[PDB]
Every structure is written in structure tokens, then in C-alpha cells.
Amino acid sequence: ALDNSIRVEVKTEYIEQQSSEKYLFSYTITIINLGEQAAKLETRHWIITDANGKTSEVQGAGVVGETPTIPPNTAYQYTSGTVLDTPFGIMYGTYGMVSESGEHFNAIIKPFRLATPGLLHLEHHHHHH
């Protein structure tokens, strides 16, 4: 029931540039419950930040319109997206969970990158001879 009983994994994908400039990204999240009892995702709380420092927040019921119940040792996956004003940004937040025993807690979704394949930062190394 305690925190850490829920692990959040994330993958993203730059979808398309909407020049009017805006950038559409998609993100697929897998919420895995490794706790003793089942847990229900009741709310979400996103904090999005673009390359310019402009930040926005989204608080709502469930994810993609659903409040799934994730039994123990089960993984719930879903996909959504966000439109940024810049070709890259950072996104993090929390999910409002509720244990089978009626105990409410937050599942943490660590910061993750939103970026076009051309602006994804790469550190460069090489062989020393």
C-alpha cells in the first residue's frame, strides 16, 4: 500500500510539427503495481515545461478518460500527448492512487524528455589510442 509499490515507466515520440510553431508529442506510460493489494488511479497531475521556461499544469480525473484498477503484479499501459511551443521540454508529475484498503497515495512519475529526434542531446565519446 505504501509508496514505491507503484512503478511508472515512460516512452515518448515526437509526432508532428504544427506550423501556424507548435510541436505534438505522444507519450506511452506503463503503470506497474508491485504491491500486495490492488490500486486505482483516480487523478493525474502533470507539470509541463518547454525550452523557453514556460510552464503549464493539467489536473484531472483518471487518464485518457479512465480510472483503471491495477491488480497486484499487473501493468496498465496507455498513450496520450501534449503540444509544446518548443521542439523540446521536460515533463513530470503525479498520479492520485487509492489502495484496495481505501488508502490514498501518490504514484510518482519522474521527469522525462520531450524532444524531436534532431534535438535529442548526445554526449560524444571515442576510442583512445
Place this chain on the structure above:
Amino acid sequence: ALDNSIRVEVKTEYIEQQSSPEDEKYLFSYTITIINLGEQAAKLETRHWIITDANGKTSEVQGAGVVGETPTIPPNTAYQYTSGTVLDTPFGIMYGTYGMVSESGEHFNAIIKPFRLATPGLLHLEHHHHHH
């Protein structure tokens, strides 16, 4: 000439609400199918969208290709792709054109008929029944 060689079909889906305390936002996805019924390959070079919210407030999107590519659709082939858009109202309309170019080098447009974007059950269901 080749204006009839391409047919566009589309389906949509309400993904998720992206609203902030005072700024309504609704994320939609759309899956376009571009069928080349021509006897020659056709390459999608540009797109030009006209997006309208429930109040007539429109936005215009113009760019090269779709989702990062300018696909070549050979004869008798249906190319599908998915993208999306965010509206400030739970209902809206989209329409526009794709700038196509044929193997022969000729440029023409593939029309994209207007289609809706709507959150499910925005309008209550109407009921019919076998009379008598």
C-alpha cells in the same frame, strides 16, 4: 486530371483533456488513410489544414508532408498515418488539402473533406423505434 486519383478517408478519437484552471484544451487524434487509385505512384509533399473550434475561431496549419515524411503511395495502395490536434472547445471541424506530385512530375491536390472532432456523447442520443 489526377484530382480523382486520390481518395481520403478519416476517423478520429478524443484522447484526453489538457485543460488548466481557466483554459480549456481537448486533445484529439486523427487517422488519415490516403488511397491512390491511380495507375501511377503519387507522392504527398505538403499539407494545408483549416481547424475550427465550436465558435468559428480557426487556426491554419501548413507544412511539408505528414508526420515527418513525404510518402510515395504506389497505385492501388492505402497509406495510413496518425497525428492529432488540441482544441479549445469539445467540438470542432477540420478540412484542407494535400499537395500531391505524380511520378510524371505533375502537381495536384487531394481534397480532405471536412470531418468533426467531438468528445463522446456531447450531444444526447436520438431514439427511433419500429412503429405500429
